[PDB]
Paper text:
GRs mediate chemosensation by forming ligand-gated cation channels.
The [name] structure encompasses most of the protein, except for a disordered intracellular S4-S5 loop (residues 232–269), and the N and C termini (15 and 5 residues, respectively). The cryo-EM map of agonist-free [name] contains strong density features that do not correspond to protein, especially in the intersubunit lipid inlets. We assigned several features to ordered phospholipids rather than detergent based on their well-resolved bidentate shapes. Each lipid enters the pore between adjacent S7b helices at the level of the inner leaflet. Below the hydrophobic gate, T429 and T436 form two rings of hydroxyls that can stabilize cations.
Residue numbers in the entry:
A (entry chain D), B (entry chain A), C (entry chain B), D (entry chain C): 16 to 231, 270 to 444
Write the structure that this text describes.
Amino acid sequence: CLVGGAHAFILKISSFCGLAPLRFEPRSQEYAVTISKGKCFYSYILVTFLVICTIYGLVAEIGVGVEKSVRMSSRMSQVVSACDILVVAVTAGVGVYGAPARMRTMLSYMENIVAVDRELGRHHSAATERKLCALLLLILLSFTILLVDDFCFYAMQAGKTGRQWEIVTNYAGFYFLWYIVMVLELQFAFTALSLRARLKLFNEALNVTASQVCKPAFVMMKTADGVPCLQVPPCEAVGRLSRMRCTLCEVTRHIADGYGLPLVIILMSTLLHLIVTPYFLIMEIIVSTHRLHFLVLQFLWCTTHLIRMLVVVEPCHYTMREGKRTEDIVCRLMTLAPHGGVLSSKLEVLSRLLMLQNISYSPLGMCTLDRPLIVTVLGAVTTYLVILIQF
Amino acid sequence: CLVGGAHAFILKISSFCGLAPLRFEPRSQEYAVTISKGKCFYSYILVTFLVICTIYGLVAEIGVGVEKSVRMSSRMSQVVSACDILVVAVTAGVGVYGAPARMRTMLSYMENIVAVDRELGRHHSAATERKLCALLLLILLSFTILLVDDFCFYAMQAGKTGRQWEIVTNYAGFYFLWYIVMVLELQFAFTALSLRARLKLFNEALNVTASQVCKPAFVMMKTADGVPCLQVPPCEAVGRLSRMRCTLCEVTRHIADGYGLPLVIILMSTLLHLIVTPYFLIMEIIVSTHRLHFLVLQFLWCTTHLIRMLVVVEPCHYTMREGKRTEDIVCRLMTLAPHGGVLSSKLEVLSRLLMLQNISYSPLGMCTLDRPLIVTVLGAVTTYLVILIQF
Amino acid sequence: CLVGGAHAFILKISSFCGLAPLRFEPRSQEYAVTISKGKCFYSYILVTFLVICTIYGLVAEIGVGVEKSVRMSSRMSQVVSACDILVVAVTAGVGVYGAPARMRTMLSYMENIVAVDRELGRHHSAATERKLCALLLLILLSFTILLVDDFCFYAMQAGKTGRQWEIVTNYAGFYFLWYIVMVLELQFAFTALSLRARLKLFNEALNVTASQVCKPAFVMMKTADGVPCLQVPPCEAVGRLSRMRCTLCEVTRHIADGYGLPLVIILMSTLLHLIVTPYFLIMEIIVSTHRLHFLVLQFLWCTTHLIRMLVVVEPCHYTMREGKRTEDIVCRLMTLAPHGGVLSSKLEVLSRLLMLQNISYSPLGMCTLDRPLIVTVLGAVTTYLVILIQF
Amino acid sequence: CLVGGAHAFILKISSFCGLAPLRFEPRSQEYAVTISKGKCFYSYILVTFLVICTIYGLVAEIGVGVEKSVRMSSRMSQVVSACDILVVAVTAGVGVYGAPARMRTMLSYMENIVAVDRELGRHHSAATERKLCALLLLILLSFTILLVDDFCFYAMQAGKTGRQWEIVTNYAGFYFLWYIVMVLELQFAFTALSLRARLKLFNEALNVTASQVCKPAFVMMKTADGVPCLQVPPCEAVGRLSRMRCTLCEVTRHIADGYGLPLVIILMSTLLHLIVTPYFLIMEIIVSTHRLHFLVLQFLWCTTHLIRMLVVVEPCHYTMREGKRTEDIVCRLMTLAPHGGVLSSKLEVLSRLLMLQNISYSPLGMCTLDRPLIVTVLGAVTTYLVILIQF
């Protein structure tokens, strides 16, 4: 098995988190990849250690009570902080303990994607992977910088009373589990975008099928000018592309299964944090609005909990749009195809595939990842805030 | 008519409840079954007796007022307890009074399922039925143990003032109606899972149809190694399987009709209890949090009201997934099938059946049983609790 | 044009309300029907008179203020009573002013339904029309009896202080507008059920098509035993039935257009009244619970506002179920039909009609009339009541 | 490129707003149109100037505080006024800065619509364009009159204390941004209605196809009587119309993309204003109800925020209805078409296009513009108001 681009890059990053217990073997543009049981062992230790340190750190700060426990200014603030920590520990737990089975799934289906790549002539655009690798760095580095500021702030807030080393021992684990949760979200997105790039490329082979029938080996090649061009009759190409369309839908279901449970806990904790964080921001902007550094951080957290949702639902939406574009192309193409020909009989099949096999991500069946899920989540958030804030 | 496995086992359990007024006649791996009017008569008496005892027990505890009526610490607590008892008495009532007509329906369609079993070569996996029979015992015995603890607790709470025998006379009926409601939920689930096992087995016959056309009597048999293998040409098999697909969809509609009204009252009472039970738990964890045994029981009830919902919606979701798997297989299979052949003409039919006949449970048309119903119910529960608790 | 049964009976009742400005000419089992401009003129006067009397009666009771205005015990109670009266006056207004155009539509499509009746051999079951005519009498007479009790109660409540004749002059108009709104709801239901009976009868002709192909003039006749039997080859019958299926879907869209705007205002006022009526019931059962006659009436109103919703959504749901039954029959029938025959080519067409033309009522596009609309309405009602009642 | 009617008229109006940076060249019934970079430059200046003046005007009135700041009678009233201004400045910003790319899109697809017009024989009905041009004038002039009254009122309210010139300098910019937002909404509606007129006209060519096959060059012409009549065999017409159906669906997706982001911000601000405006109306009708001129204006604003929503969702709904009418016609037409003919093979294709390519507007994928979006928005509005008003 081989992997490249920003998907291969996030797997390197995820390996240290224990989210991708893989060995990597550098080729020209790709790495060869296999499971490593030693990294699974390391990965299981790391997250278990961090969860123990996080729970006992939580117990310690509850034991300090509500006066000095900066995250826990009240009995109810203790419960909120415990649930916040709990959902992150559960999300990072499911993320890391599930990772070996998820990589076994990835290496299983990637052998079929390689066959699709050959038919499409897939080659990794350096400019495009640089865009997506820069986006990994942008999102992940920005979040890492936020975690450091949040930790430094609360440590200095306690450092004003000499208690910073205890705060470090009690919360350092929680910030590492935060990093693991974002890397898991980025690992999905750039896995899903890596498939969306192949639907997008499959649709271009189907357009050039239409242009050849409109305006008359592996399926598609570059010309001497590098433009896409078709090496086989459209009758054969549509049959070959119909098989590839089935394969891409199967890969979608493996991705949605492997990340399905993580994504549900990520969605609930997003919803939780988008209620909890604006609430205490609003309470603190009405009362003691002089704590400007706190208010800045809590705003940047509200922003981050929205981005973390978009990182999940947007890669899926962009995959839906490529499916809709296929239906548009096939409709056009089958009005062009002549009556009673072989090509139109191949397009009768493909159009049934479009009606039968949709491409979608529905984690555990609870919901469909698409932009209407944003409207659903934000409508709930504002409903609860209007209830909670108004009194 | 004959029935086996965990479905036949839950029918034995349900017979004593009067939910399955059947005689049973043991064969090698199955029971022969027919309606017994005497068990219908017994069943109608039993539930009518228990409902009378429950209503008059409710009247008695309202008559004791709010001081000593342990379930009724206030005027509003009286109304809550009356509605709790009322929905259980209605659910057990519809369950037991409807049971003879429901068994007549079961024995009507099971004669067709036997024909599907012959074509598929269905035989009951001892290991699989042991799994599902152990799951019946696990869920039902755990609930029975909870009912005993709840009853013993409140009787001892009253026994501290000598009034336990009156509590026994006033609530024993209600705990038996609770048991009847769970057995009805388990009777559905293991009826639905018994069908899902046959869709799952029908899909495997359709995969081996694809492998024979990919890599070239009743439809399917075991090899000498026990692997599935096809005794007829794929052209005949797909036609035979299309007929069986229609039969399974028809059986789904009989199950959804027979249990439809029970399931709606089960869903409302789940929603009611998931509001009422966490509310009084939260009031009692803020005030008088020393009543640790009460808080433990009320938590185990909240857990149970979630499980009772999953027992209903999960068997249906797992049945949807087998239908989606059929669409995936048929798409694959009809790209493999050659142009203009008989097989592809048989697959044109089957693909129309998939678009026309879905397999789903929609009780009384109110809703579809699937995991999105969990999100809908839990979002309402938390909306009401946020309203009720916040003031 | 001719019409019979409970549909023809409700048109007689509706004529006096001005909801069906028709002449009627009695035949053996049917009436001949044509528009009468004189009844349109009468109808426009009647509702305009009743609306004037109702508005000026409302103005009078607002002018008496909140002390003696029994419907208006507070400033807010004035606003509630005004909106209650307003939505009924608007619903009866749209009902009666729209009625001539609606009857022109009815007489337009009923000429095509007569053609469907000939093909199906439709004859009116005396026992069935007696059921539906008894249901008209049951629902309408029960409501009329409730209106009289409500009016007599409030007149006697004012009659205890001699003011009953003013109450009569100020509210008699409103009770007649209430009667007009129910007759409009019954006029829809028994129009929709009159179509559902023809889908139900069309599906039976399609089953006997299957039995003739399974077990081998106008389309269908009774045997000498009165059992349905087919007078033409199944190849012709399926073609003839496909045309009739199109005609029934067209009639559905005329009904949904003609009653669409009434039904939306009926749904909002149902939602309004299911909030307003339980609220003031709950306030009056907590405080001054001795007003037993008031509490009884307000409960019977809550019951009536639910029934008025079911009268609207249930006839539509039962029409959906007959469409689903067609899809089940066509799937079965086209697995039975032989490969490459004419019959299977006719069933390819019909199955496309089922996928393209659904049968549904969606008033003004706002919603679909089906039992999920009950869950939507009742969830809102309980959301508002939980907000309003809890403080 | 050429454009006519109320679409061409709203583009003239939009040019001064900078929403359509176009030159216009008058022909007999149409204008020739091309992008003008000078109007893009003017347009970017104008909105940037107005946004600067609006923000600094907002800063000034916040700087005057809450006593004299008539829009800002409290600290919370400051925040409300700032968000109101902010969403309008954002909506007008996206409107005007996006306008050049949107016009490039319009001139791209309008060249294909001209081809559809030739096939359909499209000519602009003077009476119909007069209706839609009068509707532009009615809606836009009525809104302009409301803006003047609102501005004159608040200036005179401040003019009673000599501060009117400062109010003019601080709010004149905001009223011009309000005008730009309505013109953008009208620019969409009359673009969408301009397409709906061509679906409506395409459906009439398909009916006359049915009548010619029922009752036996560019596709369609007027007779010597001006009735539509078909110049080609139905076999060719259905093929030609299938291609045109694809082209119209493509144009729909360009419109939805170009206006998609504006429409989402328009929907949120509609939702915001339908909460905020009735709330402060209700507070001001309970307390100080003597401010009759204020109450009148705030009611006319509530009315306007509903109309602004209908202006957006109704043109889209009317486009859905023409698609449904196509499905009705195609079903009818393909029962009429003879078995095994060429025409029925052309109708097999078109019916797949109807199942694959729907016509809809879904801005950014968040929602579908149709009348169910009204019910969704108004249910939220009343939920928040019931929460906010009740305490």
